[PDB]
Amino acid sequence: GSSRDLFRALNSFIQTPTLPPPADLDAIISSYLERHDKPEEGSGDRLNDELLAIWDKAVQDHPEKYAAFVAVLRQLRPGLGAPARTFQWWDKLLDPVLDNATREKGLARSFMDFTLEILSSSIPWLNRLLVRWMELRESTDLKEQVLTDALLAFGKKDPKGFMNALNAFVLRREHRNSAFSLLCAFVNSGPPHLYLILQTPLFGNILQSLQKDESTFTVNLALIALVMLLPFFPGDIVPYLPTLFNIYARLLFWDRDSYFAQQWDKVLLDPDYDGHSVPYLPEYFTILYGLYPINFVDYIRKPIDVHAAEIRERSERFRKQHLLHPNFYEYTIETEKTNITRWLKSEADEIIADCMALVVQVSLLRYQRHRLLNDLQYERFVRQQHMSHMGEL
Amino acid sequence: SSRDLFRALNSFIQTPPPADLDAIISSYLERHDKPEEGSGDRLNDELLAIWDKAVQDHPEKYAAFVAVLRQLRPGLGAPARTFQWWDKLLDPVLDNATREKGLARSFMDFTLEILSSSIPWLNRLLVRWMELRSTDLKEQVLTDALLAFGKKDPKGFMNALNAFVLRREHRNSAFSLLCAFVNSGPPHLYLILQTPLFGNILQSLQKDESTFTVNLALIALVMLLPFFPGDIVPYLPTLFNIYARLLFWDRDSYFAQQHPWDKVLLDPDYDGHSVPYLPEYFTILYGLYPINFVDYIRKPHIDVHAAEIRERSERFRKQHLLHPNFYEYTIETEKTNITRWLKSEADEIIADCMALVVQVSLLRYQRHRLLNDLQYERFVRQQHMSHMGELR
Numbered sequence: 001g002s003s004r005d006l007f008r009a010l011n012s013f014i015q016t017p018t019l020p021p022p023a024d025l026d027a028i029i030s031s032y033l034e035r036h037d038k039p040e041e042g043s044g045d046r047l048n049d050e051l052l053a054i055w056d057k058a059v060q061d062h063p064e065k066y067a068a069f070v071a072v073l074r075q076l077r078p079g080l081g082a083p084a085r086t087f088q089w090w091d092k093l094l095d096p097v098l099d100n101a102t103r104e105k106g107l108a109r110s111f112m113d114f115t116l117e118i119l120s121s122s123i124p125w126l127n128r129l130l131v132r133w134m135e136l137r138e139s140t141d142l143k144e145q146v147l148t149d150a151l152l153a154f155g156k157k158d159p160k161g162f163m164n165a166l167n168a169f170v171l172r173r174e175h176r177n178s179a180f181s182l183l184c185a186f187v188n189s190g191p192p193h194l195y196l197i198l199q200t201p202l203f204g205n206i207l208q209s210l211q212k213d214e215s216t217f218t219v220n221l222a223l224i225a226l227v228m229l230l231p232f233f234p235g236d237i238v239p240y241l242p243t244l245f246n247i248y249a250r251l252l253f254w255d256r257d258s259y260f261a262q263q264w265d266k267v268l269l270d271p272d273y274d275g276h277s278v279p280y281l282p283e284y285f286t287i288l289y290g291l292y293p294i295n296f297v298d299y300i301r302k303p304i305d306v307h308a309a310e311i312r313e314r315s316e317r318f319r320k321q322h323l324l325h326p327n328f329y330e331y332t333i334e335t336e337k338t339n340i341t342r343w344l345k346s347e348a349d350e351i352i353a354d355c356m357a358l359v360v361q362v363s364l365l366r367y368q369r370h371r372l373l374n375d376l377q378y379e380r381f382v383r384q385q386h387m388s389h390m391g392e393l
Numbered sequence: 394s395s396r397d398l399f400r401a402l403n404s405f406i407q408t409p410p411p412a413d414l415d416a417i418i419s420s421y422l423e424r425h426d427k428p429e430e431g432s433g434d435r436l437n438d439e440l441l442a443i444w445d446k447a448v449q450d451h452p453e454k455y456a457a458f459v460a461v462l463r464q465l466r467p468g469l470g471a472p473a474r475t476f477q478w479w480d481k482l483l484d485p486v487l488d489n490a491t492r493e494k495g496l497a498r499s500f501m502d503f504t505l506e507i508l509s510s511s512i513p514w515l516n517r518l519l520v521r522w523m524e525l526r527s528t529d530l531k532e533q534v535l536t537d538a539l540l541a542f543g544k545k546d547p548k549g550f551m552n553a554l555n556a557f558v559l560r561r562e563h564r565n566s567a568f569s570l571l572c573a574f575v576n577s578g579p580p581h582l583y584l585i586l587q588t589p590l591f592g593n594i595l596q597s598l599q600k601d602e603s604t605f606t607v608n609l610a611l612i613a614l615v616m617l618l619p620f621f622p623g624d625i626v627p628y629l630p631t632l633f634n635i636y637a638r639l640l641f642w643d644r645d646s647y648f649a650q651q652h653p654w655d656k657v658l659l660d661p662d663y664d665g666h667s668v669p670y671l672p673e674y675f676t677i678l679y680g681l682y683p684i685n686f687v688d689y690i691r692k693p694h695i696d697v698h699a700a701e702i703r704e705r706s707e708r709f710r711k712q713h714l715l716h717p718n719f720y721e722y723t724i725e726t727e728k729t730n731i732t733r734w735l736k737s738e739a740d741e742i743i744a745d746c747m748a749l750v751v752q753v754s755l756l757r758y759q760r761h762r763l764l765n766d767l768q769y770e771r772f773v774r775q776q777h778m779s780h781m782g783e784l785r
Contacts, residue, residue: 289715293715297715297719297720300720301719301720301722315720316717319717320714320748322714322715323710323711323713323714324687324710324714324715324716325715326710328691329687329690329691329706329707329710330703331691332691360714360751
């Protein structure tokens with residue numbers, strides 16, 4: 001096993017390809033990787049040229065062999081040399097897998113395993129995945145499962161870059177709902193260092209959507225994302241607190257905001273499908289009361305006196321749902337914001353548990369959230385499908 | 394037929410009353426307009442003569458004499474004639490309540506007739522209600538009479554009781570009777586603020602060392618505060634300090650190991666280490682002045698003691714919802730804005746406070762049950778005390 005032996009073994013595997021690769025092929029590949037230390041010189045160039053030739057002459061026009069080629073590419077992954085060749089190959093195989101994900105058994109699983117092996121060893125990826133996920137999004141298919149699992153893996157590897165690329169799609173109206181949906185799905189996968197959203201423009205544009213957009217569906221997605229994001233950096237949102245409180249007041253009068261549409265890229269109100277109240281508004285109250293109760297109740301008390309009284313009357317049903325907060329025995333309105341020991345001692349799951357202890361062991365919550373996301377995707381499908389029909393006359 | 398009342402009385406006593414006696418009495422009171430000049434005085438003197446010469450040593454005629462005095466009560470005239478007779482018959486009735494049938498009920502009917510017509514009474518009832526201190530008919534009569542007089546004159550009632558609160562040997566009984574008074578639902582309970590009783594209740598809560606005495610005072614305070622919540626602002630620091638003292642009752646009882654208010658000392662045989670009614674005190678405090686209460690708990694009037702106050706108030710915090718005052722008032726305007734109390738009555742304020750706990754009859758009934766339990770415990774305690782010593 002040096003080079004000629006690999007060429008003959010690969011071509012022989014191509015003439016008769018199976019799904020479980022024979023042991024002697026694993027042996028020839030292992031001996032090649034062992035007997036070649038630094039293919040970064042020429043060895044990688046000739047290996048690349050060989051894989052290109054094999055793809056052109058034998059694989060390109062045989063989708064049933066794609067999974068086998070990917071399996072071989074997995075074993076041959078360590079020997080390409082420069083990481084850009086592995087990029088060039090993943091990018092080359094991206095669309096053939098997407099186009100044959102539903103028809104070739106095991107191809108999606110093998111390509112996922114190849115992706116995970118790439119990610120677990122030692123922007124253009126994210127943008128390509130995002131744009132393609134927008135394209136194939138006008139039921140669930142294998143192509144969307146592949147795109148979704150890959151997006152979650154890339155976001156787990158680069159959370160700051162992920163939420164950066166999505167911000168571009170947040171600026172465009174036609175993908176904001178989808179972007180917020182993917183953001184919720186991303187947050188649902190439990191990725192690390194979610195606080196990096198503060199070193200990214202996504203958070204401010206979420207708040208801008210909550211403040212300006214008029215579609216109940218868009219604002220509701222943004223609210224779900226905000227509720228899922230706040231427990232991961234509660235001590236860093238102090239400068240954003242007036243906006244968050246003002247956002248609560250806006251959603252509190254959603255039955256008026258929708259009404260005012262009586263004629264930054266705004267999403268306008270859809271009078272056909274958007275309801276009159278934000279379903280996830282109560283949970284937002286809980287997290288605000290859980291994190292900064294003294295500042296929150298001071299905002300509700302003292303923002304028109306009549307408008308303030310109405311804010312109070314509509315906050316009454318939330319007041320009767322929450323116990324007295326322990327901060328009332330310990331902090332002032334200043335020290336509530338200034339003392340950060342609370343956040344040093346507790347992680348997101350503890351902060352969530354302490355908050356949910358105020359409402360009159362987490363996997364349940366994540367499962368519920370995934371069910372909610374499925375419900376909302378089904379609702380959007382229903383909407384979109386009702387739109388294609390109405391108008392046809 | 395109305396002129397020979399004395400002849401009929403002397404003939405009837407010296408031997409149910411016949412219909413013609415009640416008829417002559419009724420016609421006498423009918424055609425006699427203003428007996429206040431003298432006819433009532435001579436009637437009183439004659440009834441006294443009959444009592445001395447014919448009734449005093451004739452127990453079977455006590456009930457008949459009381460029935461006649463009940464029917465002739467409107468014609469006595471001056472209210473001092475009625476007081477003179479009630480005072481004269483008090484001890485004979487109490488002494489014969491158990492032996493003469495219907496006598497207790499007849500004297501109760503006399504009391505009811507007294508209540509439905511237009512201090513020395515209270516002092517006489519109080520002194521005898523201390524002298525008597527299972528269940529006793531004499532104590533029930535004395536209690537019901539004290540409660541009836543207190544319902545008619547609540548400010549005067551409390552006033553006499555304040556004297557017994559000042560006596561160490563009478564404080565427990567005075568507070569028990571006070572609890573029964575507040576439970577009877579008397580009017581104008583805010584008048585306790587125009588009397589020194591409230592301040593001496595707080596002084597007992599601050600200084601007395603008997604768990605039984607302090608818990609009685611706390612129960613009385615809880616029953617009293619909803620009747621004048623807007624007037625207790627100057628007392629708020631004291632009430633808060635009282636809560637803190639009771640919050641550390643298991644230390645204060647222990648801390649009373651080395652040492653013009655006459656303190657009731659700790660009774661080491663039965664007094665426990667915690668005040669049972671302390672949570673309800675928290676509830677009423679949280680119901681009335683939450684912003685000031687939690688501000689007191691956050692920073693009291695050292696840091697370690699404070700943290701301990703916090704740690705013990707945590708368990709009460711987990712039982713109460715967020716108060717609506719936090720959407721409406723500051724710590725200043727909570728004391729300054731009085732609109733809450735203008736339209737509100739005591740029962741409404743109590744019901745609203747009970748909206749924080751995680752329509753009045755049941756409360757009164759439970760309270761009376763508790764008061765009976767405590768009186769029965771006091772009986773047990775005394776019965777045990779008297780036997781510890783006979784062995785010596």
